[PDB]
Design a protein around this motif. Structure first.
Motif, PDB file in Angstrom:
ATOM      1  N   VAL A 197      57.222  39.611  42.084  1.00 38.74           N
ATOM      2  CA  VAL A 197      56.216  39.251  40.851  1.00 38.74           C
ATOM      3  C   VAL A 197      55.217  40.046  41.117  1.00 38.74           C
ATOM      4  O   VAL A 197      54.622  40.314  42.029  1.00 38.74           O
ATOM      5  N   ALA A 198      54.379  40.565  39.867  1.00 41.13           N
ATOM      6  CA  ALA A 198      53.243  41.271  40.008  1.00 41.13           C
ATOM      7  C   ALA A 198      52.469  40.930  38.771  1.00 41.13           C
ATOM      8  O   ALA A 198      53.224  40.717  37.886  1.00 41.13           O
ATOM      9  N   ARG A 199      51.311  41.261  38.783  1.00 43.33           N
ATOM     10  CA  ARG A 199      50.317  41.026  37.683  1.00 43.33           C
ATOM     11  C   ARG A 199      50.304  42.289  36.848  1.00 43.33           C
ATOM     12  O   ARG A 199      49.906  43.367  37.437  1.00 43.33           O
ATOM     13  N   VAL A 200      50.259  42.264  35.432  1.00 42.35           N
ATOM     14  CA  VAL A 200      50.298  43.525  34.491  1.00 42.35           C
ATOM     15  C   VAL A 200      48.923  43.970  34.582  1.00 42.35           C
ATOM     16  O   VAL A 200      47.949  43.025  34.477  1.00 42.35           O
ATOM     17  N   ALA A 201      48.653  45.071  34.532  1.00 45.60           N
ATOM     18  CA  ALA A 201      47.371  45.866  34.422  1.00 45.60           C
ATOM     19  C   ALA A 201      47.377  47.048  33.609  1.00 45.60           C
ATOM     20  O   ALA A 201      48.825  47.685  33.341  1.00 45.60           O
ATOM     21  N   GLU A 202      46.594  47.479  32.777  1.00 43.93           N
ATOM     22  CA  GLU A 202      46.600  48.534  31.797  1.00 43.93           C
ATOM     23  C   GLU A 202      47.069  49.829  32.473  1.00 43.93           C
ATOM     24  O   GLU A 202      46.765  50.222  33.621  1.00 43.93           O
ATOM     25  N   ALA A 203      47.741  50.622  31.655  1.00 45.56           N
ATOM     26  CA  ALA A 203      48.160  52.018  32.046  1.00 45.56           C
ATOM     27  C   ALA A 203      46.972  52.712  32.419  1.00 45.56           C
ATOM     28  O   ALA A 203      46.099  52.883  31.409  1.00 45.56           O
ATOM     29  N   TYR A 204      47.363  53.987  32.936  1.00 42.73           N
ATOM     30  CA  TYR A 204      46.244  55.125  33.054  1.00 42.73           C
ATOM     31  C   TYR A 204      46.738  55.823  31.512  1.00 42.73           C
ATOM     32  O   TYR A 204      47.637  56.030  31.199  1.00 42.73           O
TER      33      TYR A 204
END
Lengths: 43, 43
Positions: free
Chosen positions: B4-11
């Protein structure tokens, strides 16, 4: 709902933060927002 | 295997490339390498 993506190396300052950088296209396929949790599996 | 991972905005330069930046810790949980494909689902 799911989406397939290609794994790429993390940004150095992201290492160890348990995040996955996904753009607005992948997020829209999932109906997720920044800060939501996703489950990732190998294809 | 999954992780499981937390979504973060793309570069910005990654936008539209269908990649997910995941560090060596998440990749090891999955047994994936850079360039492999993963399936992502909402939790």
């Amino acid at each position: 709902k799911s989406v397939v993506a290609r794994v790429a190396e993390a940004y150095p300052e992201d290492v160890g933060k348990r995040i996955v950088r996904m753009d607005k296209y992948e997020r829209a396929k999932l109906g997720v927002s920044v800060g939501d949790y996703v489950e990732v599996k190998k294809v």
